A paper describes a structure:
On these grounds, we identified the same enzyme, EUGO from Rhodococcus jostii RHA1, as a promising candidate biocatalyst for the efficient and selective dehydrogenation of dihydrosinapyl alcohol into sinapyl alcohol. This VAO-type enzyme is easy to produce using Escherichia coli, and its crystal structure has been determined. To achieve this, a variant of eugenol oxidase was engineered for the oxidation of dihydrosinapyl alcohol into sinapyl alcohol with good conversion and chemoselectivity. To understand the effects of the introduced mutations in the EUGO8X and EUGO10X, their crystal structures were solved at 2.3 and 1.6 Å resolution, respectively.
The mutations identified from the initial screen, L381Q, S394A, S394V, I427A, and I427V were next individually incorporated into a thermostable variant of EUGO (EUGO S81H A423M H434Y I445D S518P, referred to hereafter as EUGO5X; Tm of 80 °C) that was obtained previously using the FRESCO algorithm. EUGO5X L381Q S394V I427V (“EUGO8X” hereafter) was more selective than EUGO5X L381Q S394V I427A, converting 90% of dihydrosinapyl alcohol with 77% chemoselectivity over 24 h. Despite this, however, the EUGO5X triple mutant was still not a perfect dihydrosinapyl alcohol dehydrogenase. By soaking the crystals with substrate, we obtained the structures in complex with dihydrosinapyl alcohol. Both catalysts contain five stabilizing mutations (S81H, A423M, H434Y, I445D, and S518P), as well as S394V, which have already been discussed in our previous engineering study of EUGO for the dehydrogenation of 4-propylguaiacol. Focusing on the hereby identified activity-improving mutations, the crystal structures show that I427V introduces more space for accommodating the second ortho-methoxy group of dihydrosinapyl alcohol relative to wild-type, explaining the improved conversions allowed by this mutation. The combined effect of these mutations rationalizes the enhanced activity of the mutant toward dihydrosinapyl alcohol. By superposing the substrate-bound structures of EUGO8X and EUGO10X, a subtle ∼20° rotation of the plane of the aromatic ring and concomitant shift in the position of the propanol side chain of dihydrosinapyl alcohol can be observed.
Numbering used by the authors:
A (entry chain D), B (entry chain A): 2 to 526
The structure:
Amino acid sequence: TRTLPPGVSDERFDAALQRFRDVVGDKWVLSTADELEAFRDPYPVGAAEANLPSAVVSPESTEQVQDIVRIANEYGIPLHPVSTGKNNGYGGAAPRLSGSVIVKTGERMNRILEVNEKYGYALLEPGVTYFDLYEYLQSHDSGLMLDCPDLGWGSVVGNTLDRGVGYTPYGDHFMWQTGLEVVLPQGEVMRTGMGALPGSDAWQLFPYGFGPFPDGMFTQSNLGIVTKMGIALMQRPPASQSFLITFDKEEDLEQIVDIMLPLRINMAPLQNVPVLRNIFMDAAAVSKRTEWFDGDGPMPAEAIERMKKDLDLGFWNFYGTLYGPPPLIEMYYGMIKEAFGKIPGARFFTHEERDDRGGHVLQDRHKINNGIPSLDELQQLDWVPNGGHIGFVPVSAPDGREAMKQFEMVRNRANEYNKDYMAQFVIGLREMYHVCLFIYDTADPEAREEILQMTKVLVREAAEAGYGEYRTHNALMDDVMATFNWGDGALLKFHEKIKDALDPNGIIAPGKSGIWPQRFRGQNL
Amino acid sequence: TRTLPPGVSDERFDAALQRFRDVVGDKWVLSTADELEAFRDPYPVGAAEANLPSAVVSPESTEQVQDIVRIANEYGIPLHPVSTGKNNGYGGAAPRLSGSVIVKTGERMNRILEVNEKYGYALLEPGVTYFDLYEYLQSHDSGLMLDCPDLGWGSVVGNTLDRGVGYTPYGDHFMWQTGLEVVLPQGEVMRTGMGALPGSDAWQLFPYGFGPFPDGMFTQSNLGIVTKMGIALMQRPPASQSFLITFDKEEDLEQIVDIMLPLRINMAPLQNVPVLRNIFMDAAAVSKRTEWFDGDGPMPAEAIERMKKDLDLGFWNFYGTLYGPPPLIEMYYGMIKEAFGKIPGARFFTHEERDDRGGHVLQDRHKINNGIPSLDELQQLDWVPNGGHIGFVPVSAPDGREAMKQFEMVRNRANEYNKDYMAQFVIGLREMYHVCLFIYDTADPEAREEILQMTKVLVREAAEAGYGEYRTHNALMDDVMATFNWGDGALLKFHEKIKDALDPNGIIAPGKSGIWPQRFRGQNL
Ligand SMILES: Cc1cc2nc3c(=O)[nH]c(=O)nc-3n(C[C@H](O)[C@H](O)[C@H](O)COP(=O)(O)OP(=O)(O)OC[C@H]3O[C@@H](n4cnc5c(N)ncnc54)[C@H](O)[C@@H]3O)c2cc1C
Ligand SMILES: Cc1cc2nc3c(=O)[nH]c(=O)nc-3n(C[C@H](O)[C@H](O)[C@H](O)COP(=O)(O)OP(=O)(O)OC[C@H]3O[C@@H](n4cnc5c(N)ncnc54)[C@H](O)[C@@H]3O)c2cc1C
Ligand SMILES: COc1cc(/C=C/CO)cc(OC)c1O
Ligand SMILES: COc1cc(/C=C/CO)cc(OC)c1O
Ligand SMILES: [Ca+2]
Ligand SMILES: [Ca+2]
Ligand SMILES: [Ca+2]
């Protein structure tokens, strides 16, 4: 065929593409199947085609984004805005609504607009990756550090707008977000916070501004195209130390979480964001499945014990990092060794104590936790051939028995659909993100379908136990919004009413987070 | 004359009140001149009458709130929701729009719904004062501590909904707000975050839920009536120590702020929210103006010197608190002494070192910063007869020169309108609230008119320098919103579209933060 926006003829789409070319330059409008292939989900879900873009437009300026949005309103073209488009696990760059035009802001709006060393912040355009920001801070001998997710090729801005997270004390990216500039769905531009007071220098010093705080309405959202975003940057501490605790039993998870909470809730001695990764997650970072089990179905217990023995890891591996003067590091590490020492079999290693293959993960977290971006986690996709992943991430109370129950519910479905269960518990002050990566052969349509069906059952199963996900893939967005339905869907009704108010023609990423504007509500897609 | 809602007849109002009576009980609907006098602004601003309530309704439950809002929609009666209604300095309980009915949620909805010791949170109704919650924590041998403003008789919820602040590490109340329940302007009820997932234990554990993050839109806002709100509660540390640094010269302000920033930006050694108060603010807390000066206008230099000598305080007095094991306190306090000691005339005191009258402020801060509510600061209102105050609170970069120019700018105008300039800088990580309390004789019409015209001038002057206010009085909300006018007022136009979409009848607190629903837009008020 040719992929087209819903309701839009071949003819009117050709016209609108030429309007875009007049705004951005012919170079920067892609509309052919060979050109669009790189903007498909690199980790596709389900057997069938889905989430197909009709074109890709790369603007160079806030002004060009306005003009793009005006043209889109004139023609009823839907727009999916991305920064770097690296949302792998949740859809890649692909739109939720098939036929949408991707607006890749970060291809050319990729400039670092300010890094302020005195007050510790940055003012960024969407194309700035973590690597770009790191090389800038290194170049200018900065005293600041950034906060990055596991992979460095994403966007500081784009990750924030999906409320992603990293692992330093500044790991809640949306919390340290300060000021943004946004083009609203009919082309008007707006600045939040002290940016709305012209001549203020405090756009990136004071988040709230005056009046209703709106910045949160542009995260996991479709109320506009963000063109600038500010973010706080932490001073680098004078030293740091990273550590691993290996735990032998699957059932250790309960005592691990329970001892952790008192050590974490006051942000000391667990100063950073700890991660609790199972042996499958760690083995996937350093080895192929076939090294351990070349056979059929779920991995047997003896192969698991071989994994743990060969890598000298446990079933549960705790990674953390301490910052500050060396005496403060010694004391805190002492408190952490005494507390988790009560769990029989716990073994402790610093980042200076492990140079084997099993310690490759520890060395990678020691980078990530010190604001040094990395791609070594890509090695996880070599667990199986042509590997891809989807993120199933329920929220869990920092309680041992609730975690244990989430672990068991998920592994039981994992086995049923013949998929390994790799887990990374990402631990905040009072909440945990229970990251379930399902790694699968993207060239196998049967595997792709099992992944769709399995995660659709897990969304439902988790919700029936009172567990929701914080973030999800294009293919699960409707399902996941449907679980947040207290008061006969009051939350969704709220978002719809606001969407239709700011977006009367229904242009911006329809269906993002399950939020469709009037003209699409009631169809399949 | 009877105070009536705009456009509502005497007969339609009387029917509407009776319907209110059928919902909450006849006891809980005040409407006579005598019953209303107590709900007028206790610190009135300007000579003229303004902000008059037409009635006060006191609901017992969320369901009654819903019914109140439905009746209001049917009769076009505007509703000013408040919790305890002690927003003194900003209007008290008085509505922005005269003729509004106050919905005082806190009078009967005053119950603590949950205090969770393990995860450290509260779930509260709007009527829970800081004293009430402190009493609960004391009776239950709680290991938690709250965070309170200077006056403990206000609402934890209400203060949060105006983005008020306290002085412990949890001093940013909105940040630690986690979950709320709200009756939207047409009577439907909604829960944010994990509260939207039926059966989740995580409403007060994970703030964001899924999809766009809305809770900020209900702060300093008129998009609904809030009926429940959660907030995180910090663990009480094993020890604390408060301290006072006195600085001799007016001109020291610049050096105090510039030495302060590097000790504050990493939240250590300045772990709490330091305040920097001037000698008038400290004298007003412990003495009357006439103890220093009886006569003509601004206070002369000899008299200021008498206050400093008699109270053993400086012109600028810096108050902080340290928390933790005594080794840590001592380390941090040694760092604070070594840095600020570089300013000639700096003098240092811990809370155990001063039992004189000048030390009463230090001892009050020592309570506040340890989560112990107080009404001692009410004494500042005895500076002059029939004392009242208004909060003019521009935001400042944490920069000595910026602080100095704000100080000079406000003092010049204070002099010009024959008022004393009481200052309390409230110091965040990257920003300062420059609290300018103007204390005045509320019974004197010319004094009230001076307050109105001086602060009108100050809003305009500050914004011409690139400064805005974080919070303001009823009388200044249109002037302050008007300064945030980047891109031809994009911010206010964004808020009005949301306002008109969730409040089609224009019911909830019209004019709050200068946001007026369409049916009032264009008129005087
Ligand atoms: C092995 C692996 C590990 C991972 N680890 C982590 C981790 O530790 N933490 C984590 O957070 N994620 C993690 N992820 C997920 C993903 O890699 C990152 O979150 C990634 O940074 C998101 O993609 P991005 O930065 O390119 O954002 P984008 O793809 O550019 O944006 C994501 C979404 O935000 C919205 N958006 C983006 N830009 C705009 C804009 N200008 N205007 C409006 N809306 C916009 C759109 O909805 C878009 O689809 C991991 C993924 C994998 C496969
Ligand atoms: C001497 C002095 C010192 C002060 N110090 C401080 C200080 O340190 N910190 C500080 O923050 N303030 C301070 N203030 C300001 C004020 O006294 C307090 O902030 C006070 O706690 C606010 O009043 P309240 O808690 O009763 O809230 P309320 O008056 O009950 O509510 C405040 C506002 O929030 C909104 N609101 C409240 N409840 C609801 C609801 N249920 N639904 C919808 N909207 C709602 C309304 O717009 C309402 O007017 C001070 C004032 C004085 C005079
Ligand atoms: C903490 O959030 C995430 C962490 C991770 C961590 C992956 C490491 O195996 C992945 C994600 O999406 C695919 C996330 O959203
Ligand atoms: C920090 O916020 C405020 C502090 C204060 C502190 C007053 C102490 O004199 C007052 C306010 O409004 C009147 C505030 O909004
Ligand atoms: Ca338990
Ligand atoms: Ca009923
Ligand atoms: Ca300076």
